[PDB]
Design an enzyme around this catalytic site. Structure first.
Site, PDB file in Angstrom:
ATOM      1  N   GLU A  16      26.291  20.436  87.539  1.00 47.10           N
ATOM      2  CA  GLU A  16      25.102  21.231  87.250  1.00 47.10           C
ATOM      3  C   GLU A  16      25.410  22.675  86.977  1.00 47.10           C
ATOM      4  O   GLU A  16      24.553  23.350  86.471  1.00 47.10           O
ATOM      5  CB  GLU A  16      24.147  21.263  88.467  1.00 47.10           C
ATOM      6  CG  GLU A  16      23.781  19.875  88.942  1.00 47.10           C
ATOM      7  CD  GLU A  16      22.750  19.234  88.023  1.00 47.10           C
ATOM      8  OE1 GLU A  16      22.248  20.043  87.127  1.00 47.10           O
ATOM      9  OE2 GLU A  16      22.422  18.082  88.090  1.00 47.10           O
ATOM     10  N   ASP A  32      16.476  24.022  81.027  1.00 41.79           N
ATOM     11  CA  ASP A  32      17.416  22.948  80.857  1.00 41.79           C
ATOM     12  C   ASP A  32      17.283  22.350  79.449  1.00 41.79           C
ATOM     13  O   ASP A  32      16.464  22.850  78.660  1.00 41.79           O
ATOM     14  CB  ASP A  32      17.273  21.957  82.048  1.00 41.79           C
ATOM     15  CG  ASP A  32      16.016  21.107  82.090  1.00 41.79           C
ATOM     16  OD1 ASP A  32      15.331  21.070  80.953  1.00 41.79           O
ATOM     17  OD2 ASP A  32      15.691  20.467  83.086  1.00 41.79           O
TER      18      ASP A  32
END
Length: 162
Positions: A11, A20
Site C-alpha cells: 500500500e 486511489d
C-alpha cells in the site's frame, strides 16, 4: 517477511489525503477514508478517525496506528466470518497472510463473496485459483499488487515480495 511488511509494501505510506486508482480518498497505509467525492467529507472522516483537527495531514505514528487497527480488523473479520474462517484454518502461514491482505484491501464481505474462488482454495486447486483470480476486477484494476498476492497465495512462498 510478515503481514505488516507485506501490506506496507503493497500500500505504500502517504501522510496526506490522496485518491486511489478508483478515485477514493485514502490516507496512511491503505486507509480508506471515504467513497464520497467530497474532500471535505474526507477531511471530516480523518479528524474523527484521528481524534484531532488534522487539516488532511497526519504523522507517521498516526498512520501506523490506523494500520494496526486495520490489520487487526481484518484478522478478526476473517475469524468471525463463517465462510472465511474455515478457509483460514486450512492454510499454512504464508497463505494465511495472503488471505489477510485480500481482506484488508477488499473487505470481508468482498472476499467472502468469491464463492468459486473459495471452493478452489478449499479443494487446494492452486493453479486454477490463480488463473481464475486474474479475471477479477481487482486484478485488472491494480495488476502488480494483485499479481504479488496471487503468487503468494498460490505458491505459499514470499518470493514475490523478495
Amino acid at each position: 517477511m510478515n503481514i505488516f511488511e507485506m501490506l506496507r509494501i503493497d500500500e505504500g505510506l502517504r501522510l496526506k489525503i490522496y485518491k486511489d486508482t478508483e478515485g477514493y480518498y485514502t490516507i496512511g497505509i491503505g486507509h480508506l477514508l471515504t467513497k464520497s467525492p467530497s474532500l471535505n467529507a474526507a477531511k471530516s472522516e480523518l479528524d474523527k478517525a484521528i481524534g484531532r483537527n488534522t487539516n488532511g495531514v497526519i504523522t507517521k505514528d498516526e498512520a501506523e496506528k490506523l494500520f494496526n487497527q486495520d490489520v487487526d480488523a481484518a484478522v478478526r473479520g476473517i475469524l468471525r466470518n463463517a465462510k472465511l474462517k474455515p478457509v483460514y484454518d486450512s492454510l499454512d502461514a504464508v497463505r494465511r497472510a495472503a488471505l489477510i491482505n485480500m481482506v484488508f484491501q477488499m473487505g470481508e464481505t468482498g472476499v467472502a463473496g468469491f464463492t468459486n474462488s473459495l471452493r478452489m482454495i478449499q479443494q487446494k486447486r492452486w493453479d486454477e485459483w490463480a488463473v481464475n483470480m486474474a479475471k477479477s476486477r481487482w486484478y485488472n484494476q491494480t495488476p502488480n499488487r494483485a499479481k504479488r498476492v496471487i503468487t503468494t497465495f498460490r505458491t505459499g512462498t514470499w518470493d514475490a515480495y523478495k
